[PDB]
Design a protein around this ligand. Structure first.
Ligand SMILES: CO[C@@]1(C)C[C@@](C)(O)[C@H](O)[C@@H](/C=C\C(C)=C\C[C@H]2O[C@@H](C)[C@H](NC(=O)/C=C\[C@@H](C)OC(C)=O)C[C@@H]2C)O1
Ligand SMILES: [Zn+2]
Ligand SMILES: [Zn+2]
Ligand SMILES: [Zn+2]
Ligand SMILES: [Zn+2]
Lengths: 187, 81, 122, 54, 145, 99, 47, 160
RNA sequence: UGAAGCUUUCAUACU
């Protein structure tokens, strides 16, 4: 006198939220309906686990909790500057990577045309001149065979972009073919 | 362990031992609202006695700021029985 | 023959340990039984002491039992410091001092630092 | 066992030298900290005077 | 005066203790310049033990005087000493040290205490991180807004 | 000009884009709160002021960068909107206007 | 010791990654090495 | 495997987001994979870039072939004489054409590949017709300047 | 690749 998984999957508007034990509830139709509410994060997923919570693996070795960039810039490791500590803490304050309300944390969840200057220095490519032609070695194949079909809006100097463009390490630019000011903000 | 019967006008008291720490969350920071106790807990020889250890009361009992924020001052007489 | 020697030497160690425990006079009799046991162990196995003095401020703090804190229960705290530092520690005086003796100056310094840390905590 | 004891003894001697250096270094650090003391107190007072001003 | 006053701090009468602490606090608040520091550090380390006093008055005056001395001599040295003291002592003294750290961080803005306290969490030992966590707990409870 | 804001009777706000060349209405953002919306007012290209049957006013602003170009994570839309203002007035608001 | 399984965590407590085990001191780890679990885990890693 | 391109010849300056940033101009590289070694714990010079379409992988293989990336011959591909330290941009037919100038080849040469990626391991084996071609390869080709990679030709088996 | 639970005579640590 109890549903089967496939039978209950046929009745509900959202069958992908139905699970193994959901047919064993006292009121599975209300349970599945609440599992489909347009909010309401689910249960912590380790209720059925016999290894309780956390723990599990002591294999990984973790280094000491790294100090924030500005605090590690304060040069704490004798003359001490307070104003530098104050101005730096407030003026140098930054916001860390926050997470959304829906997101939850699990035991295994802590593990799972432009080029950089270091790669251009290691690859043996010189800097961009004022008015000349200094293409990368991958640009000769693009000038010979044609533009890439995966990125048709990309511009390269010599083929689509003029030589005087090129500035620093920027060897390409993507050219894709209102009243954006916020309303109430401090001056 | 709490009496928790709706109170009235009697003012709860604290002994010299714990004077100034909350009766609900037993805390050492910022008191806010005066404690009221039921009439039975203040009747007869019980008047003015400590709301924790029934001993002599020397100061008024207070709920801390955190308890009044959470409306833990509206739950009834906090005399420990 | 080695196991027979070990058995005899064990019986002698237990005898000397009993003499030292049953019976300062108690320290002299224990030390004598430890020396007798050592001679027998040396026979069985065959078959520059740097010293520093740590002053104990008992004249400044007569209320504090520094000797009790350094020795610990059954001498376990003293023996632990002696084992960790590979140093021999002897309390001497009324002035009251700990004589630290080891094979290396480094072992003496480590033992002196541990003794000074216990004295400071006292 | 004797060879292991000899290597252990060499390691122990190195550890003892490191411990003696740590014992000194701490006293040197205290001396630098105390000689640097009046200047640090003056700097804190100057910072307090500047924050009050602004 | 003050060197004549510092031995009275060890008296065991409540009125004497409260008045002595209040006087030393006033002196540290206004006449901080005359006393060479070091004595202020000794006086604050001695006041550390009065935070466990079983009379609210004594605790209130001790909190006030510690705030004044910290405002006077600066957060850096007292914070270093308080961290060292938090590392090596028994339970009640460590709790009082936590209260003292919170007081220092409230009088001198927590921007002066937080980096040195977070640098101590980088030490690799257990019961060391738990102490940092207990200190952070009481710090936030004590500073509130 | 580009976007459409929809008020639900029990959900708060749905953001929609009209694809002029594809002839498509696509939902690209929604909210994380149930709101009994009585009226709504646009403050700028990213922010909306709303009112409620229960006497509340709220302001919701879209996060930076977003996409704009779209071709659920809470049984909803993939991107969410943030609530930057909440106020209880004590009476039911039926009109909101910037002027 | 020199075995890669023995290691020191951020807390400072010793831990055997081969057996997924925690030990208070060196003697507990050496008693664990002579136990059935470490020998069977080394025999599994022998193949 | 068809949409992913195997890159070979990566130095220590190249990284996992660096290959995805360099391959972003060729096509929409969705993911980058770099197998780490067991003894050193770093990349062995060979990696993979999984894109969205096969045309982007073909354009990356035809554009970034035999390039000089980080001072290394990086090349993208579709995922008794011993020659070591050979460039991955050359194929079996290219190695047979390069070996045809010294002597005559008996059959088609073979190059060793990794069991994980399967593009290039680093060593190859080629057999000559006679011992004169092997001596000419050990005299001239053993040390010749290849495409940004110093190769080394040696004898696979020799009897004293 | 993986799943290390339960119990006591152990023994060792923290409250
Ligand atoms: C042994 O008796 C008990 C346990 C029971 C009792 C209720 O009968 C007795 O009255 C009571 C009195 C003494 C004690 C130890 C309890 C309360 C006090 O404790 C102290 C140990 C703390 N110390 C602190 O508060 C830290 C900082 C200071 C300066 O405060 C503040 C506000 O910064 C917290 C509390 C102030 O303690
Ligand atoms: Zn009552
Ligand atoms: Zn009481
Ligand atoms: Zn409370
Ligand atoms: Zn193990």
């Amino acid at each position: 006198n109890r549903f089967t998984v496939a039978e209950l999957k046929q009745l509900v508007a959202r069958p992908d939220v139905v699970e193994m034990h959901d047919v064993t509830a006292q009121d599975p139709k209300l349970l599945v309906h609440l599992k489909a509410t347009r909010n309401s994060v689910p249960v912590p997923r380790h209720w059925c686990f016999k290894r309780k919570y956390l723990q599990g693996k002591r294999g990984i070795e973790k280094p000491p909790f790294e100090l924030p960039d500005f605090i590690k810039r304060t040069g704490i490791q004798i003359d001490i500057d307070y104003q530098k500590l104050h101005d730096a803490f407030f003026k140098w304050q930054t916001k860390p990577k926050l997470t959304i309300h829906g997101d939850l944390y699990y035991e295994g969840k802590e593990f799972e045309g432009d080029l950089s200057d270091e790669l251009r220095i290691s690859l043996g490519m010189p800097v961009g001149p004022n008015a000349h032609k200094v293409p990368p070695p991958w640009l000769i194949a693009m000038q010979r065979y044609g533009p890439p079909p995966s990125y048709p809006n990309l511009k390269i100097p010599g083929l689509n972009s003029p030589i005087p463009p090129l500035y620093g390490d920027v060897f390409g630019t993507n050219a894709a073919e209102i009243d954006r000011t916020p309303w109430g903000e401090l001056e | 362990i709490f009496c928790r019967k709706q109170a009235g006008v009697a003012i709860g008291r604290l002994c010299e031992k714990c004077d100034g720490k909350c009766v609900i969350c037993d805390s050492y920071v910022r008191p806010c609202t005066l404690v009221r106790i039921c009439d039975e807990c203040n009747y007869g020889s019980y008047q003015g006695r400590c709301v924790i250890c029934g001993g002599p009361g020397v100061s008024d009992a207070y709920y801390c700021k955190e308890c009044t924020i959470q409306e833990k001052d509206r739950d009834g007489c906090p005399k420990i029985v | 023959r080695e196991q027979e020697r070990a058995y005899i030497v064990q019986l002698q160690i237990e005898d000397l340990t009993r003499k030292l425990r049953t019976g300062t006079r108690e320290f002299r009799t224990r030390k004598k039984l430890e020396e007798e046991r050592h001679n027998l162990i040396t026979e069985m196995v065959a078959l520059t002491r740097v010293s520093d003095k740590v002053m104990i401020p008992q004249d400044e703090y007569p209320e504090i039992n520094f000797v009790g804190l350094l020795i610990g229960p059954r001498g376990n705290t003293l023996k632990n410091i002696e084992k960790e530092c590979n140093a021999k520690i002897m309390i001497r005086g009324k002035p009251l001092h700990a004589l630290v003796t080891a094979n290396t100056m480094e072992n003496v310094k480590k033992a002196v630092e541990q003794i000074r840390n216990i004295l400071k905590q006292g | 066992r004797e060879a292991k004891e000899m290597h252990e003894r060499k390691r122990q001697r190195e550890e003892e030298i490191e411990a003696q250096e740590k014992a000194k270094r701490e006293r040197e650090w205290q001396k630098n900290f105390e000689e640097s003391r009046d200047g640090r107190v003056d700097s804190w007072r100057n910072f307090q005077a500047n924050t009050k001003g602004k | 005066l003050l060197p004549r006053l510092t031995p009275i701090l060890k008296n065991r009468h409540e009125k004497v203790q409260e008045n002595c602490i209040d006087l030393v606090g006033r002196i540290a608040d206004r006449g901080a310049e005359y006393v060479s520091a070091r004595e202020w550090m000794r006086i604050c380390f001695e006041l550390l033990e009065l935070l466990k006093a079983h009379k609210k008055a004594i605790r209130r005056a001790t909190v006030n005087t510690f705030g004044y001395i910290a405002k006077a001599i600066g957060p850096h040295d007292v914070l270093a000493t308080l961290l060292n003291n938090l590392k090596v002592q028994e339970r009640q003294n460590r709790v009082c040290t936590t209260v003292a750290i919170a007081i220092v961080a409230e009088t001198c803005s927590p921007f002066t205490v937080l980096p040195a306290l977070m640098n101590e969490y980088r030490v690799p030992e257990l019961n060391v991180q738990n102490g940092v966590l207990k200190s952070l707990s009481f710090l936030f409870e004590y500073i509130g807004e | 000009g580009h976007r459409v804001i929809v008020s639900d009777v029990q959900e708060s706000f749905i953001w929609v884009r009209y694809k002029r060349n594809e002839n498509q209405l696509i939902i690209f953002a929604d909210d994380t709160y149930p709101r009994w919306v009585t009226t709504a007012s646009l403050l700028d290209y990213d922010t909306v002021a709303g009112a409620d049957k229960f006497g509340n006013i709220c302001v919701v602003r879209l996060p930076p960068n977003t996409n704009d170009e779209v071709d659920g994570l809470l049984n909803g839309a993939s991107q969410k909107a943030e609530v930057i203002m909440n106020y209880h007035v004590g009476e039911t608001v039926l009109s909101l206007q910037k002027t | 010791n020199k075995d890669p399984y023995f290691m020191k965590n951020h807390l400072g407590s010793y831990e055997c990654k081969l057996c997924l085990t925690l030990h208070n001191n060196e003697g507990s780890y050496l008693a664990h090495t002579q136990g059935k679990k470490h020998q069977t885990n080394l025999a599994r890693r022998a193949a | 495997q068809d949409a992913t391109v195997y890159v070979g010849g990566l130095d220590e300056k190249v990284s996992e987001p660096l290959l995805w940033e360099l391959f972003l101009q060729a096509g929409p590289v969705v993911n980058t994979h770099m197998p780490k070694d067991r003894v050193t714990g770093q990349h062995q010079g060979y990696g993979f870039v999984e894109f969205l379409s096969e045309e982007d992988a073909d354009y990356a293989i035809k554009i970034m072939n035999m390039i000089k990336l980080y001072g290394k011959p990086i090349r993208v591909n579709k995922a008794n004489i011993f020659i070591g330290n050979l460039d991955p941009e050359i194929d079996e037919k290219l190695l047979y054409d390069t070996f045809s100038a010294f002597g005559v080849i008996l059959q088609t040469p073979k190059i060793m590949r990794d069991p994980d990626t399967g593009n290039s391991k680093g060593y190859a084996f080629i057999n000559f017709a006679s011992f004169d071609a092997s001596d000419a390869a050990i005299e001239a080709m053993n040390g010749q300047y290849l495409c940004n990679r110093p190769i080394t030709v040696s004898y696979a088996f020799k009897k004293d």
